[PDB]
Amino acid sequence: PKAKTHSGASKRFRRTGTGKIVRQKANRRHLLEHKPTKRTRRLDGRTTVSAADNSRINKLLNG
């Protein structure tokens, strides 16, 4: 059978032109009144996945 890929993993991680996998950052969807803007600014944009999770993330994405 064709190898199905994950869905929850293809909706949460992306790939760039060179080939790095990127994601978003948590803790930024509610209870935002008591978070200083420096904290939210840190939790913004798209960082790169941890080296410890690159294997699993690649497993899920290519399937």
Partner: protein, 49 residues
């Protein structure tokens, strides 16, 4: 499976934005490669590409 803790694919936010199924995407070509591929002539076209 992470042993019962929330997995890496279930605790991170889902990405942002929609897909726009009506996207128009082009197969792009650079002027330099046309220059090197068409050294002596011109009259470039889609089939000439």
């Amino acid at each position: 499976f992470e042993g019962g803790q929330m997995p890496i694919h279930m605790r991170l936010p889902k990405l942002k934005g929609f897909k726009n199924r009506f996207r128009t995407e082009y197969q792009v070509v650079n002027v330099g490669d046309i220059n090197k591929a068409f050294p002596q002539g011109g009259t470039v076209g889609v089939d000439e590409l």
